[PDB]
Design a protein around this ligand. Structure first.
Ligand SMILES: *[C@@H]1O[C@H](CO)[C@@H](O[C@@H]2O[C@H](CO)[C@@H](O)[C@H](O)[C@H]2NC(C)=O)[C@H](O)[C@H]1NC(C)=O
Ligand SMILES: *[C@@H]1O[C@H](CO)[C@@H](O[C@@H]2O[C@H](CO)[C@@H](O)[C@H](O)[C@H]2NC(C)=O)[C@H](O)[C@H]1NC(C)=O
Ligand code: LQZ
Ligand code: NAG
Ligand code: FE
Ligand code: ZN
Ligand code: ZN
Length: 341
């Protein structure tokens, strides 16, 4: 039974998965795909067993019968007596970030600016802000709100891809995987840091992890938190230290999904895998560390303490929460039930 086939998205996650595979005695093996949607299809076909997904994709996967199995849990200063694997998930803060030097830019003056998104269909980088924007303008032309953007996964010849740069060679412009320079939390923030965009739609944790010497990548190496500002919904700007009172929403954590008939087996293998390669696991950091990838968030986010049990044996709708599930349905009206593949 207990071989789990992970689905990696892109060549970089593939490399990391191959390392995990080798260190696991081939308990985990790897399948690769160019996009998250493709990976979901591989899981539906039964050619892969699982992968960690942002909440927006969990919505896509859930409609096709896939279920949440274990969720990412980061550091917290409450619930601590309880062990990480048993602790409830706090969710993360979706935020809109701008440069302080870019004075006078607020939530009320984003029209015609340049934006940086993690990817299309993702929670913090797309679903939350575009949902909020459609709603406030009473219009579905969200592709004409910003003058130019980098929204991995949109038509590469549309304005929503204009700011994306592709890989080393300019190839793969706008693909929704790490090959694209401005993909994901880190990529979208880089897009803002290099002044390619006016605002980045990421999470709270991204800002802190790539400023004040926390990174060391050459583009982040000199960034300082005082150079950035959060855009609050009230038309006000605040230091990044004010996220708890200046965010767009709380997002449910990224979670591992698998086909329902495979959930229990995937779950067992993963709990044994994090005991070996997790934060203080038998072989981290001496041999391989599952939750570390040099600020690239490959397979899993780098700030992950552990993969936690769910409790309540939640369906995907209960896991995402009815608030966030109606938000996505209304936004997708711009482009009630049925699986896409
Ligand atoms: C937003 O994100 C930062 C980092 O993810 C949080 O600050 C971390 O908080 C932990 C304890 O919760 C501290 O021990 C770490 O030292 C902090 N990290 C760093 C790198 O500074 C912060 O709690 C979050 N703020 C809000 C309002 O959510
Ligand atoms: C966009 O607006 C719609 C319409 O109000 C929001 O959907 C509603 O959300 C509330 C709160 O969850 C429910 O009580 C309503 O029933 C929903 N209405 C409809 C028509 O479905 C949606 O939340 C908004 N999107 C965002 C991102 O805020
Ligand atoms: C960590 C995964 N959670 C998602 C929130 C499973 C859950 O169902 N948790 C939960 C808790 C702990 C308290 C109140 C309400 C909810 C539903
Ligand atoms: C692989 O899984 C098997 C089955 O439980 C376990 O006995 C073995 O020790 C595991 N090895 C590693 C390194 O995970
Ligand atoms: Fe996310
Ligand atoms: Zn809030
Ligand atoms: Zn239930």
């Amino acid at each position: 039974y207990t071989r789990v086939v992970w689905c990696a998205v892109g060549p970089e996650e593939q490399k990391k998965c191959q390392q995990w595979s080798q260190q696991s005695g081939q308990n985990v093996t790897c399948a690769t795909a160019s996009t998250t949607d493709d990976c979901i299809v591989l899981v539906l076909k039964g050619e892969a067993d699982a992968l960690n997904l942002d909440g927006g994709y969990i919505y896509t996967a859930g409609k096709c019968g896939l279920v949440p199995v274990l969720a990412e849990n980061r550091k917290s200063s409450k619930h601590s007596s309880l062990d990480c694997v048993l602790r409830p998930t706090e969710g993360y803060l979706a935020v809109a970030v701008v440069k302080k030097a870019n004075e006078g830019l607020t939530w009320n003056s984003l029209k015609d600016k340049k934006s940086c998104h993690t990817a299309v269909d993702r929670t913090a980088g797309w679903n939350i802000p575009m949902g909020l924007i459609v709603n406030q303008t009473g219009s579905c032309a969200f592709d004409e709100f910003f003058s130019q953007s980098c929204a991995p996964g949109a038509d590469p010849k549309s304005r929503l891809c204009a700011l994306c740069a592709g890989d080393d060679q300019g190839l793969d412009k706008c693909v929704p995987n790490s090959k694209e320079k401005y993909y994901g939390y880190t990529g979208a923030f880089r897009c803002l840091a290099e002044d390619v965009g006016d605002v980045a739609f990421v999470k709270n944790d991204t800002v802190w992890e790539n400023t004040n010497g926390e990174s060391t990548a050459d583009w982040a190496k000199n960034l300082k938190r005082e150079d950035f500002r959060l855009l609050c919904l009230d038309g006000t700007r605040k230091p990044v230290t004010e996220a708890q009172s200046c965010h767009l929403a709380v997002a449910p954590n990224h979670a591992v999904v698998s086909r329902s008939d495979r959930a229990a087996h995937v779950e067992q293998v993963l709990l044994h895998q994090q005991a070996l390669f997790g934060k203080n696991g038998k072989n981290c950091p001496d041999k391989f560390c599952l939750f570390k990838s040099e600020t690239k968030n490959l397979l899993f986010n780098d700030n992950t303490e552990c993969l936690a049990k769910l409790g309540g044996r939640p369906t995907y709708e209960e896991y995402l929460g009815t608030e966030y599930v109606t938000a996505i349905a209304n936004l997708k009206k711009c482009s009630l039930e049925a699986c896409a593949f």
